[PDB]
């Protein structure tokens, strides 16, 4: 019965007055999930599904990890092999 969520807002929601990085250490939580999600679906439908993504999103750098040109490709390909069974 203790289930309750409080979802309120405020008129004061300023921008992040903090610095920025330029290619930080380790993969971000966002990309981490994106790679896993993709690796899970490709392992569920096969290489054909993967290759289709490599065509439609070829010019989207966020899908460039599907190509071996990205270091993320290693993490990704090794993940597919673990998601397949």
């Amino acid at each position: 019965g203790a289930q309750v969520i409080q979802e309120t807002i405020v008129p004061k929601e300023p921008p992040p007055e903090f610095e920025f990085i330029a290619d930080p250490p380790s993969i971000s939580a966002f990309d981490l999930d994106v790679v896993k999600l993709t690796a899970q679906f490709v392992a569920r439908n096969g290489r054909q599904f993967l290759t289709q993504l490599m065509q439609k999103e070829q010019r989207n750098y966020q899908f460039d990890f599907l190509r071996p040109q990205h270091s993320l490709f290693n993490y990704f390909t090794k993940l597919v092999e673990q998601y397949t069974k």
């Binding site: 309120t8 994106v34 993709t38 679906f41 439908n45």
Partner: protein, 38 residues
């Protein structure tokens, strides 16, 4: 879009729906800075 019904086996549809969640997840941060310490 929406939840009316499905048109058949469309993995691309579900993939874009899963993608929406991740995008929105990081788009709107909650009312508290709940980040992992190390």
């Amino acid at each position: 879009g929406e939840l009316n019904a499905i048109s058949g086996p469309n993995e691309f549809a579900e993939f874009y729906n899963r993608l929406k969640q991740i995008k929105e997840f990081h788009r709107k941060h909650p009312n508290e800075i709940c980040v992992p310490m190390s």
